[PDB]
């Protein structure tokens, strides 16, 4: 209703929306204008990552939490920046895509695990460093 509503709106726009489009639960033009703009840099991050290596894994809610937590907590132990927030989002989308693929009905667990982490561990950093507007400025970068 208050600060929770702000935090909920930010995470929904920046994280949940892209995962639901990476997952085919939601079409491309179901996205807010803010979302297809930042989709570009998330999409580009995904392709940059697929050059590097491929991901293959998860059978239980318990296994999603430990595997997801382990990676992301190691992703930000060192430092937090908008570039690795992209990787966080992207990584969250790739584990959700795995779930809807296997039709295990665990993608919901992925979204909620990523949401919880971004709220507790990332949102104070992102708010103080420009938040939603900055990630929008971060999306432009070099259009090569």
């Amino acid at each position: 209703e208050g600060e929770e509503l702000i935090y909920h709106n930010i995470i929904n726009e920046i994280l949940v929306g892209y995962i639901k489009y990476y997952i085919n639960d939601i079409s491309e033009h179901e996205l807010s204008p803010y979302q297809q703009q930042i989709k570009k840099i998330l999409t580009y991050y995904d392709e940059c990552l697929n050059k590097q290596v491929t991901i293959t894994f998860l059978t239980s809610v318990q296994e999603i939490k430990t595997q997801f937590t382990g990676v992301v907590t190691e992703l930000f132990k060192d430092l937090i920046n908008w570039g690795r927030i992209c990787g966080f989002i992207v990584f969250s989308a790739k584990m959700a895509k795995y779930c809807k693929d296997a039709n295990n009905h665990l993608e919901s667990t992925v979204i909620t695990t990523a949401y919880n982490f971004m709220k507790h561990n990332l949102l104070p950093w992102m708010i103080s460093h420009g938040g939603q507007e900055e990630f929008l400025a971060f999306s432009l970068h070099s259009d090569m």
């Binding site: 840099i41 991050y45 940059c48 990552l49 590097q52 290596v53 991901i55 595997q67 382990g70 990676v71 992301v72 190691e74 992703l75 060192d78 920046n81 908008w82 570039g83 690795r84 927030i85 992209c86 990787g87 966080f88 992207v90 990584f91 971060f138 970068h141």
Partner: peptide, 19 residues
């Protein structure tokens, strides 16, 4: 593994955070 994926996610994120 998992520790190596992070450093991949890290340095990619680091490369995009440039300039």
């Amino acid at each position: 593994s998992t520790k190596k994926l992070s450093e991949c996610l890290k340095r990619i994120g680091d490369e995009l955070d440039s300039n």
